[PDB]
Amino acid sequence: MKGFAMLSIGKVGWIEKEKPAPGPFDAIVRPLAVAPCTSDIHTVFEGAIGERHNMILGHEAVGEVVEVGSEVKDFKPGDRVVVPAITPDWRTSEVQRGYHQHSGGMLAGWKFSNVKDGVFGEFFHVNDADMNLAHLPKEIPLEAAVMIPDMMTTGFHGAELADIELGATVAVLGIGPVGLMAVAGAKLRGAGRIIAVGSRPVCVDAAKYYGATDIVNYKDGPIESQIMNLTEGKGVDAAIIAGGNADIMATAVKIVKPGGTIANVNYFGEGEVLPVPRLEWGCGMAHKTIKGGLCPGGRLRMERLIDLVFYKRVDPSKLVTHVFRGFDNIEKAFMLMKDKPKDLIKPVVILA
């Protein structure tokens, strides 16, 4: 089996492994469309996950079931499905506590390209298919559906974590593809004014498209000072962090009103301490709740979002700026993620 993988930190390239075999509850899927995530980049050229040798990359795919186990009941070979980035083992302690994201350990929900070969192969292995796969309606285009596995649940679980109230003002720090979905999520939660913080013209134009009402470029002065003016010094009702480094946490706390929420879905890789300003955090009493969690995965999550797209509630189409064909391009698309052109948001390779 041919598959684009991580060779060792700082080194990738196509390799060959043995086609996976489904367990009684698993399914083997053949990619139809995939996408590279900035996370893979950090995983390969920054060892964000530790050292890994010959691990196929990728965790965002839409495929066709080619083989199922003896115990799979809802998916048969030939079925078109959307595959979640998070594919947990549903029979664990934490699944009973309500946090499947952490089934069997912190961030254990995430398997693809972490402790299991990713989706960038001629085939890949999905565990517990009846629990972790969702059928793909034929009316939803491959390009768009692939934004569902990770971009859309991360952005949306940003908006979810914020406890956004009807007509509340929400600030989104980081307008990348995840931020763009976090902006759409704030709009899906009844957000009134949505202040998107970003500087890429391609990202800002998309943000306005998804509901952004005010754009804030940091190259105009401090973010906390700009948001404060925009809100007559009232601050925002919530702040969703979708990107940036450690610092961005301080910004968040400073622009959020007392009793406000700061929801984080960004993956910090630098330093070892995320800054929480004690003065603006009411010396630990301003009731500014800070949240931060991995995006939900699993069938239901996928089906939920799939309806959101099916009923024109949101269209992830705008996130895809590049489209390529054939496996060979999985590599071209990948690198494209390492050096973000000013016209790039999210590339996708149809696998025809």
Identify the helix (H) or strand (E) that includes residue 2.
strand 2-8
Hey, how many other C-beta atoms are within 10 angstroms of the C-beta on 2? 15
- Whichever of 310 and 313 has its CB closer to Mg ion, that residue is 310
Q: Output the DSSP codes for 54-75.
A: SEE---EEEEEEEEE-TT--S-
Residues 32-91 that bind Zn ion (CB under 5 A): 37-38
* Residue from 52, 59, 102, 346 in contact with a copy of itself (CB under 8 A): 102
Interface map 63-82 toward Cl ion (x if CB under 5 A): --------------------
Residues 218-237 that bind Cl ion (CB under 5 A): 231
- Whichever of 101 and 231 has its CB closer to Cl ion, that residue is 231
Which residues are CB-neighbours of 214 under 8 A, at least 6 positions away?
Answer: 193, 194, 195, 196, 230
User: What is the Cα–Cα distance from 193 to 204, expressed in whole angstroms?
Assistant: 15
Please say whether the beta carbons of 57 and 4 come within 8 A.
Answer: yes
337: nearest Cα among 24, 14, 45:
45
- Whichever of 119 and 191 has its CB closer to Zn ion, that residue is 119
From the list a copy of itself, Cl ion, Zn ion, none, which binds 310 (C-beta under 5 to 8 Å, kind-based)? a copy of itself
Please say whether the beta carbons of 128 and 26 come within 8 A.
Answer: yes
Annotated binding residue 15: no
User: What is the Cα–Cα distance from 44 to 55, expressed in whole angstroms?
Assistant: 10
* Residue from 128, 174, 330, 334 in contact with a copy of itself (CB under 8 A): 128
From the list Cl ion, Mg ion, a copy of itself, none, which binds 231 (C-beta under 5 to 8 Å, kind-based)? Cl ion
- Whichever of 64 and 165 has its CB closer to a copy of itself, that residue is 165
Interface map 247-276 toward a copy of itself (x if CB under 8 A): --xx------xxx----xxxxxx-xxxxxx
Please state the φ and ψ torsions of residue 173, each to the nearest 5 degrees. Answer: -90, 105
Distances (CA, A) of 263 to 225, 304, 320: 20, 21, 25
From the list Cl ion, Zn ion, a copy of itself, none, which binds 199 (C-beta under 5 to 8 Å, kind-based)? none
Q: How far is the CB of 40 from a copy of itself (least distance, A)?
A: 15
Q: How far is the CB of 200 from a copy of itself (least distance, A)?
A: 22
Using CB under 5 A, list all residues that contact Cl ion: 231
Using CB under 5 A, list all residues that contact Mg ion: 310
Residues tagged in the binding site annotation for NADP(+): 175-178, 198-200, 218, 265-267, 340
